[model samples]
Target chain A: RALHRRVNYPSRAKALGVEGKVRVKFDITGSGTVTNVQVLSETPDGVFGDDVVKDMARWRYRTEAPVENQVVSIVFKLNGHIRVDDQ
Target chain B: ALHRRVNYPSRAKALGVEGKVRVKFDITGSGTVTNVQVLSETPDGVFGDDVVKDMARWRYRTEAPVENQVVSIVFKLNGHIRVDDQ
Candidate 1:
């Protein structure tokens, strides 16, 4: 649903034409909100991590229990195509 | 002898990622985590890749034609420092 709002590609990555992935891990509290966002995978150094970490803060979820060690991965592919692994 | 030395993957640690990394694999001629596909995982791809790569270095009593076997790790970081020979 939020994808409809917009996820503008990180300006730094897009400007330099960086393509790869930003793998992020976080905690999903029992209240269903994200916390402790940090990058797990980076292509070289920084391209996607900061952006996704910031973006993930806005997310909400429906959860049964407080879950730690949740993950979110965003791929920065060119040619205007984007898809997450699960969806 | 049967022993395992599985390293925690750095990729999963940085992201606070954790969960099981299960591999349905084989150890035919050598006891190593070789020939792989991440069967399933949490936080998606990151944690599993770490388990698989670290497992590749694992050696057991030795490979005894162990077939259709499986191995896994849950990504958690309880750290011990590495020395760089200064």
Candidate 2:
């Protein structure tokens, strides 16, 4: 089964200076449902952390066998700029 | 019509990252990797960036015209997180 994960946030929130990181741990059930989502780490108390946890609980993986002990890291930049360097 | 597959060096693999790289290269009649340019990348970072730089050093079959091609690699920690490079 294919597993997919990424971070999500509103663009306005980013523009408002909300930035931090979130880590989540979850297990995939045999029926493809993501279960047992636990927050490993987060910052800013009630801003980005809560939102990440709520969304991750709804995640699903495409697999028949159960996938145990899956961890994901989400970093919120909140800034409109991305850093790039020339090689 | 020379195609070559270049594996990431040991130092690159030691970091455990993978992604795809799209490069434009010119192939001479004798087959060699030349003029490699990165078209895009995934999971921007130091190590990831280095892979793209290293790809430019690749030498492939030079008997073909310069064209765009995609090379994909996956960086994983026990198959949990993967960064696509294409």
Candidate 3:
């Protein structure tokens, strides 16, 4: 079984120091290919939107079962900042 | 001014459809989704058509004025299957 993970953030947000999370919903087909990666939540101005979609396109799942509906969560944080979970 | 959260159970069942579609639209400064279009499809049919019609009504927060903004609409089915013997 192989699962690939990747992270993407808005270049603009990185430049401006804004952090947020974007949850994406998608389905993995029987062939282990990801499809329909939709942003369930996004930051205003679509700051991190494009980067999220671009990164999702490269994800691969370990299962071959056709996931009718599935949701995945990705959190974007400032490069040098830490959240409560990190403490 | 034009934003909403929607749940379409009947619409999801009516089309016997599953999977998602990517819809692109512009969120005008007035908080309206104008110039709606389907960028991709799972199964092209009335389900797709219905999605477009429904999505066109979406409105979201916008900054100043924008043009040709792209968004996605994911059509999904969530439920348990019932087995029946006839």
Candidate 4:
């Protein structure tokens, strides 16, 4: 369960009118904090990957059972809208 | 590797809704996919069921049994649909 999440498109990507998605893998502790955030893959590689890794660390999930290999995707659209898959 | 493309829910796309579906499953020693289960879906009813249907037909290339594999598929639109990252 996602509690708080945030993401931003890379300025360079935005300037180029690039739109893509990033698949991120991370773990949530029993206390609901996110950790071990990683970019599993990024389309049009090298642009949006870093953004996802940096922002995902700040995400918070609802605690229940600790989860591993939890994957989520963040999609960056050219309209300045960023959407991530809910946990 | 995925051999097919997935469709985005038409209603959701028309509403400009975006979603993510997280799934957990396993691959057999012979590279057959099994135990497909959706862990979560954002925006509730949009895309999870479709993902499960697509993944069930998927096969992996592995010499050993793989367990608890987790993946997230995203649904997006650009006057067309884009299904997953990888």
Candidate 4 to truth, TM: 0.45
Per-candidate TM equals 0.40, 0.41, 0.42, 0.45
List ranges where model 1 is wrong by over 4 Å.
Answer: A1-7, A80-87, B1-86
> What is each predicted model's overall lDDT from 0 to 1?
0.57, 0.53, 0.56, 0.69
Provide chain B's TM-score, model 3.
Answer: 0.64
Model 2 regions lying over 4 Å from their true place: A1-6, A10-12, A81-87, B1-86
Candidate 2: docking tier: incorrect
Local accuracy of candidate 1 as per-residue lDDT tens digits, B19-73: 6666676675666656676788876766666556665776655646565666555
Model 3 lDDT tens row, B16-84: 345455666666777776777777766665345765666566666766655565554554433221111
Writing each residue's lDDT as its tens digit, candidate 4 over B7-86 gives 66655654567768888888898777788888889989778877778766676676889888887777654421122322
Q: Please give, for residues B1-86, the per-residue lDDT of candidate 2 as tens digits.
A: 22233445444344333444444555444454455565655545424455555555556555455454445444322212222211
Worst 10 residues of 3 chain A by lDDT: A78-87
How large is the interface RMSD of candidate 3? 19.9
Model 4 steric clash pairs: none
Q: Clashes in model 3: which pairs?
A: none
Minimum summed lDDT over a 10-residue window in model 4 chain A is located at A78-87
Per-residue alpha-carbon lDDT of model 1 for A1-87, expressed as tens digits? 122112346655554445666667778777777788778777757666676677777777777777777665565554322111210
